[PDB]
Amino acid sequence: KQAQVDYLALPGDAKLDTRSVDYKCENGRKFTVQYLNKGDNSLAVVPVSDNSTLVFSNVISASGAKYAAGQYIWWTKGEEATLYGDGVACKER
Amino acid sequence: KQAQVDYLALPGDAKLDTRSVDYKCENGRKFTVQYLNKGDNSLAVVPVSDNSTLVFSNVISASGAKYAAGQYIWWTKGEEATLYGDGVACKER
Amino acid sequence: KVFGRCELAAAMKRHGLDNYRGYSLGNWVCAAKFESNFNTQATNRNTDGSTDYGILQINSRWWCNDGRTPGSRNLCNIPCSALLSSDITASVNCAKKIVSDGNGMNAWVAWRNRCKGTDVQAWIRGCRL
Amino acid sequence: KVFGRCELAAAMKRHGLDNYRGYSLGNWVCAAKFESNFNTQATNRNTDGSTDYGILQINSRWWCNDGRTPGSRNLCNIPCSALLSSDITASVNCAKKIVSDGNGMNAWVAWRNRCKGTDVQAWIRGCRL
């Protein structure tokens, strides 16, 4: 069949680093996140649910990697993560 | 000469709508913002300065279009906008 | 309908907005003033393709459904057209949920830029409540 | 060096962290406990390419420079290596700026998930500051 995808150009000439990580949260959910780090920009594409996947943008914090989108906050610390919004604890795997 | 470009894949098959808007702020600054609206995702690519352009993600609010990235908040209301972080009042043109 | 300041304050008081979630009455009248200027029919289009409706300028992407905004969440499960009555009930109820859901009054751009840190009690003064 | 709980509370109290920006002493000892477990040499890599350093796990994308993190802001204008001493001065000072810049203690993921809303005072009890 068919499939069409829209792409956004990331600003700057900095090197782009992409990585997919699988998680499992305390509510049974299991999904995969895509991390994109390029210069001042750092994003996380997260499926906050089965029919909704959001492009989160990295926001300032003291510790960990905090990302924001919609009414959600995806905050990672090492292999761990927490999804706040309607926090849920998730682990890499 | 040359030019390299990294692209981000926007999730879903919803119709994508892009729009470029020129602004002028209270501090004399002048720039152009790119807005991308596709399904649950809404983004604003904003040059928060001369050497830094960030991809902001729309976040929940009661009114206007609030976007977040890094230590900044780009909040629009009609032809008006405000940039918070190191707010500044900006308007279209 | 364009509410008068004191006329609006009295209506909001009857709904229980004074100290609702710890927000004195003045904050709510202040937010309306700068969001819509007390006009219950105010509407404003935004860069994300959404529109703000009513005296409290409730957003079509997050709270109400105007059937023309992409990625609508409609968290107040209400049609935006129902937020344009001269009776502010619908608006007050959705506003209560918005603030009740921890979004605080910081959720309103006008409140954040024109009311936060100001003398909000002033917006209900001289009103006789 | 792995600070002892009370040993850490006394050091932080000398720096003036008790009620610093309205945060009682227990909040700071608590954040350290869950961020680093009182270990001054703790480091942790994150999904954005940054690393957290020290007893208070200061992030290398926003606050310190470790020379290997993309898009470094270095807002504390300090090399991350300087945040790994058995003396918490460098950390306390950057922490004061982080919280001083309105970021609040909410800026620390461990504080948000393990200290916020708890009996933080307990973390300085029995210590005889």
Binding site annotation covers D101? Answer: yes
Interface test with C, best of A6, A51, A71, A86 (most C CBs within 10 A): A71
CA-nearest of D14, D32, D41, D24 to D125 is D24
Q: Compute the Cα dihedral for C14, C20, C25, C29 and give only its sign.
A: negative
With CB atoms and an 8 Å threshold, state whether C59 touches B61. yes
**Domain residue spans of chain B:** 15-93
Amino acid at the residue B42: S
Burial class (CB in 10 A: 0-12, 13-18, 19+), D2: middle
**Is residue C12 within 8 Å of residue B41, measured between CB atoms?**
no
Min Cα distance D16 → chain A (Å) is 19
Say yes or no for a CB contact (<8 Å) between D71 and A66: no
- Residue C35 annotated as catalytic: yes
Determine the Cα–Cα distance for residues D109 and A65; give it in Å rounded to an integer: 9
Cβ of B1: how many Cβ atoms within 10 Å? 2
Q: Which positions in chain A touch C73 (Cβ < 8 Å)?
A: 70-71
Reduced to 3 states (helix: H, G, I; strand: E, B; else coil), residue D115 is helix
Tell me which architecture the domain covering D1-129 has in CATH.
Answer: Orthogonal Bundle (1.10)
Q: Where are the domains of chain C?
A: 1-129
CA distance D29 to D44: 19
Domain A15-93 class, CATH top level = mainly beta
Asked if A31 has any chain B CB less than 8 Å from its own CB, the reply is no
Q: Which residues contact C68 (CB under 8 A, 6 or more apart)?
A: C51, C60
CA C11 to CA B83: how far, in whole Å?
34
State the resolution, in angstroms.
2.5
Q: From chain B, pick out residues whose CB is under 8 angstroms from the CB of D73.
A: 70-71
Judged by DSSP in three states, B59 sits in: strand
For strands C51-53 and A72-77, give the pairing: unpaired
Pick from B18, B31, B65: nearest CA to C45: B65
Q: Which of B64, B68, B61 shows the shortest CA–CA distance to B85?
A: B68
Query: Residue C104: which residues within 8 A CB-CB, separation 6 or more?
Result: none
Of C46, C95, C103, the CB nearest to B64: C46
